[PDB]
Structures are given as C-alpha cells and as structure tokens.
Scaffold this active site. Structure first.
Site, PDB file in Angstrom:
ATOM      1  N   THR B  44       0.830  -1.212   0.000  1.00 29.66           N
ATOM      2  CA  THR B  44       0.000   0.000   0.000  1.00 29.66           C
ATOM      3  C   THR B  44       0.864   1.261   0.000  1.00 29.66           C
ATOM      4  O   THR B  44       0.656   2.182  -0.802  1.00 29.66           O
ATOM      5  CB  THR B  44      -0.940   0.019   1.206  1.00 29.66           C
ATOM      6  OG1 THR B  44      -1.599  -1.251   1.328  1.00 29.66           O
ATOM      7  CG2 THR B  44      -1.994   1.094   1.033  1.00 29.66           C
ATOM      8  N   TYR B 107     -13.022  -3.224  -1.514  1.00 26.19           N
ATOM      9  CA  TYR B 107     -14.053  -2.696  -2.400  1.00 26.19           C
ATOM     10  C   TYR B 107     -15.174  -3.696  -2.716  1.00 26.19           C
ATOM     11  O   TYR B 107     -16.341  -3.365  -2.489  1.00 26.19           O
ATOM     12  CB  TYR B 107     -13.434  -2.153  -3.694  1.00 26.19           C
ATOM     13  CG  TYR B 107     -14.487  -1.500  -4.550  1.00 26.19           C
ATOM     14  CD1 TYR B 107     -15.139  -0.361  -4.105  1.00 26.19           C
ATOM     15  CD2 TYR B 107     -14.868  -2.046  -5.770  1.00 26.19           C
ATOM     16  CE1 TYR B 107     -16.104   0.223  -4.838  1.00 26.19           C
ATOM     17  CE2 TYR B 107     -15.842  -1.461  -6.521  1.00 26.19           C
ATOM     18  CZ  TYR B 107     -16.469  -0.323  -6.044  1.00 26.19           C
ATOM     19  OH  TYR B 107     -17.462   0.293  -6.772  1.00 26.19           O
ATOM     20  N   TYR B 133      -2.700  -9.911   5.003  1.00 18.26           N
ATOM     21  CA  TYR B 133      -2.629  -8.481   5.310  1.00 18.26           C
ATOM     22  C   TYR B 133      -4.046  -8.006   5.651  1.00 18.26           C
ATOM     23  O   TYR B 133      -4.889  -7.829   4.765  1.00 18.26           O
ATOM     24  CB  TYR B 133      -1.998  -7.747   4.130  1.00 18.26           C
ATOM     25  CG  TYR B 133      -1.913  -6.240   4.197  1.00 18.26           C
ATOM     26  CD1 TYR B 133      -2.131  -5.535   5.385  1.00 18.26           C
ATOM     27  CD2 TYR B 133      -1.614  -5.515   3.052  1.00 18.26           C
ATOM     28  CE1 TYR B 133      -2.066  -4.161   5.412  1.00 18.26           C
ATOM     29  CE2 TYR B 133      -1.539  -4.143   3.077  1.00 18.26           C
ATOM     30  CZ  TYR B 133      -1.766  -3.469   4.252  1.00 18.26           C
ATOM     31  OH  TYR B 133      -1.681  -2.097   4.257  1.00 18.26           O
ATOM     32  N   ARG B 138      -8.971   0.151   5.382  1.00 19.46           N
ATOM     33  CA  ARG B 138      -8.997   0.327   3.938  1.00 19.46           C
ATOM     34  C   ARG B 138      -9.863  -0.697   3.204  1.00 19.46           C
ATOM     35  O   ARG B 138     -10.297  -0.415   2.085  1.00 19.46           O
ATOM     36  CB  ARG B 138      -7.572   0.263   3.356  1.00 19.46           C
ATOM     37  CG  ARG B 138      -6.584   1.249   3.948  1.00 19.46           C
ATOM     38  CD  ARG B 138      -5.232   1.246   3.183  1.00 19.46           C
ATOM     39  NE  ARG B 138      -4.339   2.294   3.704  1.00 19.46           N
ATOM     40  CZ  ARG B 138      -4.212   3.510   3.175  1.00 19.46           C
ATOM     41  NH1 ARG B 138      -4.916   3.851   2.086  1.00 19.46           N
ATOM     42  NH2 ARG B 138      -3.375   4.393   3.736  1.00 19.46           N
ATOM     43  N   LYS B 162       0.195  -9.593   9.092  1.00 22.14           N
ATOM     44  CA  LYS B 162       0.286  -8.110   9.117  1.00 22.14           C
ATOM     45  C   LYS B 162      -1.023  -7.612   9.676  1.00 22.14           C
ATOM     46  O   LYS B 162      -1.947  -7.462   8.874  1.00 22.14           O
ATOM     47  CB  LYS B 162       0.626  -7.533   7.745  1.00 22.14           C
ATOM     48  CG  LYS B 162       0.923  -6.042   7.866  1.00 22.14           C
ATOM     49  CD  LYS B 162       1.220  -5.323   6.549  1.00 22.14           C
ATOM     50  CE  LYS B 162       1.408  -3.829   6.725  1.00 22.14           C
ATOM     51  NZ  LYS B 162       1.352  -3.250   5.400  1.00 22.14           N
ATOM     52  N   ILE B 204       5.657  -4.169  10.016  1.00 24.47           N
ATOM     53  CA  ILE B 204       5.721  -3.705   8.604  1.00 24.47           C
ATOM     54  C   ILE B 204       5.279  -2.250   8.733  1.00 24.47           C
ATOM     55  O   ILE B 204       4.104  -2.016   8.949  1.00 24.47           O
ATOM     56  CB  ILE B 204       4.864  -4.579   7.687  1.00 24.47           C
ATOM     57  CG1 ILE B 204       5.409  -6.008   7.684  1.00 24.47           C
ATOM     58  CG2 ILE B 204       4.784  -3.975   6.303  1.00 24.47           C
ATOM     59  CD1 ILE B 204       4.729  -6.949   6.766  1.00 24.47           C
TER      60      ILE B 204
HETATM   61  C1  LIG Z   1      -0.774   1.440   6.798  1.00 20.58           C
HETATM   62  C2  LIG Z   1       0.181   0.763   5.833  1.00 20.58           C
HETATM   63  C3  LIG Z   1       0.870  -0.239   6.746  1.00 20.58           C
HETATM   64  O1  LIG Z   1      -0.128  -1.060   7.353  1.00 20.58           O
HETATM   65  C4  LIG Z   1       1.981  -1.039   6.079  1.00 20.58           C
HETATM   66  C5  LIG Z   1       1.557  -2.060   5.063  1.00 20.58           C
HETATM   67  C6  LIG Z   1       1.458  -1.652   3.674  1.00 20.58           C
HETATM   68  O2  LIG Z   1       1.182  -2.471   2.824  1.00 20.58           O
HETATM   69  O3  LIG Z   1       1.676  -0.478   3.396  1.00 20.58           O
HETATM   70  C7  LIG Z   1      -1.933   2.094   6.105  1.00 20.58           C
HETATM   71  O4  LIG Z   1      -3.034   1.572   6.224  1.00 20.58           O
HETATM   72  O5  LIG Z   1      -1.710   3.120   5.477  1.00 20.58           O
END
Ligand SMILES: *[C@@H](C[C@H](O)CCC(=O)O)C(=O)O
Ligand SMILES: *[C@@H](C[C@H](O)CCC(=O)O)C(=O)O
Lengths: 296, 296
Positions: B44, B107, B133, B138, B162, B204
């Site tokens: 992300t 989504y 993850y 999100r 994660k 992470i």
């Molecule tokens: C956080 C991003 C983190 O959880 C790291 C993992 C990733 O894939 O970026 C967010 O929700 O912005």
C-alpha cells in the site's frame, strides 16, 4: 437523461469463465422490454473489479451496441487509479456511451484534494456527462457535499450523483448545495423511495436485474406522484432488496436469475463465490414468490 | 525469517512519472545499511493501486535484485481480483521473492467463503510463504480469527499476518487460535510496541521509510526485552508516526524524505496528490526535529 429504474447490469460468464456475450445481450434486451430506462454496464454489480481492461471495454461496447439508442448507457468508468479511469472513460466515449459512472476511489483513501484531482482530471479528459458514485460502505471515504458542490461548479460535465449511502438527509444537502438541476440517483434499492421524495429522480438498482418490471412500475408510480401506490410496491420489493444482499449481491442476483429460468449461469469470479447458504437461497426464493415472479 | 523493522517501501517516481529506479535502489541500500530486517515492495505504501501490472512486477523484481539475499523480500501480491493476485504472486516467486503479502480484498467485499477461496486459490498456486494483510480501515471487511486459523490449519504456506487493525487484543486471539508458530507482524506503527508484547515479532512500518535506524533500534530493544528502552523509543517516534498520516502517508513520507536530503522526488500518482497543507508539513518537520534527525 437518466431517471426511474436503471439496472447496474450483472456481467454473465460462461462455464469456461469467458464473458457470456449471448446472455449479456439477452439480459439487456429483456431489461429494456420490461421497462428499465437506462443501463449501467461494468459497474460494481457488473464485477468490474474482476474484469480485464479489454473485457471491461468489451462489456461497455456490447451494452452500447445492444441498447441501440433505445435507452441511455452510463458506462462504469471508475477505479482507484486515475490514469486507468481516464482510459476507461475515453474508451466509453469513443464507443458511444451516453455518460460515465465514476466511483470515489477505494482502498488508497485519497483526501479531498485527491478527490478534486481525480474527478477533475477525468472531467477534463472527456466531454461526456459524469456521475459521481458515492459508496462509503465500500470505499471507506465519503465525498462530502462541499467537495461535490465544488466539482459541479468547476466542471460543466460533472452533472450528478449515485448516492449509495442510504442516508437520505444527504439528498437534501446535495440538492441545496449543488442546485436542483443536479441529477441525483439513488444507489441503494431499499431507500430509493425516500431518496426520490427528497429530490432524486431514479435509482441505479441491483434488484432491477432480477425484477425489472415491478422496479420500473415502482419508479413510474413515484414519478407520477402516486406515493400511496409507490408504498405498496415498496412493501412487495423490500424483502427482495434485503434478501439479495444477505450474501454478496452479485452471487445472489445470478442465483435468482437462473432460478427464474433466465439464461444466466451462476459463475462469478473470485473472490466472489457462487455457493450460497441454504438459508440465503430460501430467503431469496420466498421473496421472489411473494412478488410472484416464477412463470411456472 | 521476517522480524523487527520491515519498511513498506515507497515507490519513487521521476518528474516524468516513470519509476525512478536509481532512487528506488538507493532507498533500498540505505534501508539495509541502517538496519531494516526485510523489505515489502509494492504494498500500500508502495502505491500498488496506481502501478500498472508491468510496473508492479518491475518494482518487485528490482527490489529482489537489489536486496540480493541480504534481507528477505516480502512482495506485494494483493488485489481484489483473485486471478490477478495469482499472477502477481507467481511473478514474485519466479523472480526470487522470499514471501508474499496478500491483502484481504477491498471494495468488492467478499464474505468468509470468498476469503477462503481467495487465499486458498493463492496458496494452491505458489509455494512461497504467504502473509495475510488485514487492514479493514482500507478494506471495510475484516478477516476474523476463525477464518485466519482455518486458513493456517489448511495451507502449510499460509504462515503469518500483518495485522494493521491496531486493536492488539486481536494479537492475543490470533496467537491462541493459530498457534505461537504463527508469525504476527504489526501493520500499525503507533501500536507496534504493544503488538509485540502480545506476541508479535516485528512491524511492517510506514515510518521506517523515513527513520529506518531508530525504528531498527526500537525493534531491537523489544526483541532483547529492554522494554524500558523501547518505551523511550516509542515516545520519540510516536509524534513522527502520527504526523505521517495527518494526510496520506505516501505523500507525507516522500515529503519527509526530501526534507531529510534523500534523492526522492515528491511525485505521487493520482488520486494521491503531493501538495500538503502548511500545518501538515510543519507537524512533520517538528516530529523530525524531535528525533534530532535533522535539526540538532
Ligand atoms: C498502513 C500501511 C501499513 O499497514 C503497512 C503495510 C502496507 O502495505 O503499506 C496504512 O493503512 O496506510
Ligand atoms: C451501483 C448499484 C448499487 O449501488 C450497488 C451497491 C452496492 O454497494 O452493492 C453499482 O455500481 O453497482
């Protein structure tokens, strides 16, 4: 241009996971003959997320050619990637769509400045009318009324919304901030009735895939101002609206169409699955039979 | 294998909006020499949403080739399209990544059966270890502990999570249901400390992009059980953690990197924008000062 009952069309697939072009065409022709007033191909209910670029395009192109100018076509043209959105939008225009449906970006959660950049960049890249598709229950973020008003005032071809929030106070807020010429379409079958009395003029509906005639009669009663009769349709349709999203509506809609004898296979693309719980199928069946939709 | 501080790498872009490969390589070399223990390219924070399929594969391959075995690489292979995830995961395996990071679909909101189909299909198509993850802020949907435990029991190559919820009671639930061999990594910088005391073994991190050395020293202290020193690090890092998501973190991180003097352009891809409010830039600058990082 867009009013009354507008299905967000499913995208049928074959047993080999190709686009079932014959079934898609028959579905469109059946939708029109039953009273649907416009078409949204390659939207959410159309499994846009699991279509390739070329499949998406082909689905819009096919829907445009099948409609043959009898009803307007609002092409799904939105992802969370602006450049790809511009590419889907320009394809829809060049192939003959009448308007664009553009979702607020999901997953990467842009802020307000990003929303203005996203919709503004798309509005500058086509001359087609654009409908903002606001569905926070999927996108997490929600476009607020100030932003929506700002976009309407800035881009002449940003002309309306699909409002899937189901909080109809927002219909009043959008009407006041954006003007009564702003075209508001409900994106939530179960509150479409109240949405219209607050100023909406139609519904981009899931249920219309399954029951296009009574959805059309429902929207026709509303537009005639026969609200007593609209309420009678609502009591008949509401259990079906609800039964179709017990599990993801894409699966539930294809289950129901196949039960009704339509030539639609059950196939969906992962992460959707076609297997429904028996309690879910039973709820859908009871709601279909209460409306009286089984021919035999 | 994956432990301590693991940056979700940004993807830098040139002024012409191409991937800035020299900047990406430099960022990776810097991350390794400052003590990051692993790399997650094209997650992300990597702007995976706005990479083309080809660019996504290029980012992964270039990260794998740069790391060159020094630290393990967990490639982003997430999308809300199962077929595409399979292709991303198989590309990552064939290019030499050590593991895969697979987001719960966003989504289109699959149900539990859809999650089993999505992760099961991916686990069947590769032999690399897979990390779930989980980021409902999100994705809207959240994988529950029963679903996770069932995936873990069913597929040998589903090895970790994660966990970006920031509700650390879930770390306890996941530890008990999935077993203490299950590898839990925090996906929320601000609660990484408590996450590890509940059973996590690393993070992470968004912030490691900006302050890899201190984040590495923070995670090292936790693994040695010097929790007093880890709390001292938490108090110094927390304002930076919080300042980086006032506005979208991908913009905020790239701004912070340039204020540090690194060769990272501010360019991000729409619907993200690089313009930050004055107050946001100032909050980041002060957080960077507070870690002496730049001013002192
Ligand atoms: C956080 C991003 C983190 O959880 C790291 C993992 C990733 O894939 O970026 C967010 O929700 O912005
Ligand atoms: C629009 C029609 C409905 O709003 C779908 C609503 C949902 O969230 O399921 C569309 O694009 O499908």
């Amino acid at each position: 241009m867009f009013q009354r009952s507008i299905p967000a069309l499913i995208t049928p697939f074959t047993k080999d996971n190709l686009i079932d072009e014959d079934s898609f065409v028959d579905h469109i022709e059946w939708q029109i003959s039953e009273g649907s007033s416009g078409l949204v191909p390659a939207g959410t209910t159309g499994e846009s997320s699991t279509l390739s670029y070329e499949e998406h395009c082909r689905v819009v192109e096919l829907c445009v050619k099948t409609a043959a100018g009898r009803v307007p076509v609002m092409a799904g043209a939105g992802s969370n990637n602006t450049k790809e959105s511009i590419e889907l939008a320009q394809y829809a225009q060049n192939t003959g769509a009448d308007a664009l449906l553009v979702v607020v970006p999901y997953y990467n959660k842009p802020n307000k400045k990003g929303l203005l950049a996203h919709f503004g960049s798309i509005a500058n890249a086509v001359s087609l009318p654009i409908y903002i598709y606001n569905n926070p229950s999927r996108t997490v973020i929600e476009m607020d009324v100030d932003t929506m008003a700002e976009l309407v005032k800035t881009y002449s071809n940003i002309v309306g919304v699909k409002d899937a929030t189901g909080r109809i106070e927002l219909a009043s807020g959008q009407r006041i901030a954006c003007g009564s010429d702003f075209i508001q379409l409900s994106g939530d079958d179960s509150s479409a009735l109240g949405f219209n009395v607050h100023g909406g003029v139609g519904c981009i509906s899931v249920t219309a895939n399954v029951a296009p005639r009574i959805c059309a009669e429902f929207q026709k009663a509303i537009s005639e101002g026969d609200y007593r009769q609209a309420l009678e349709y609502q009591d008949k349709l509401f259990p079906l609206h609800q039964a179709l999203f017990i599990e993801p509506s894409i699966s539930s809609v294809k289950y129901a169409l196949s039960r009704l004898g339509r030539n639609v296979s059950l196939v969906v693309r992962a992460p959707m699955v076609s297997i429904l719980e028996k309690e879910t199928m039973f709820a859908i069946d009871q709601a279909l039979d209460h409306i009286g939709l089984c021919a035999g």
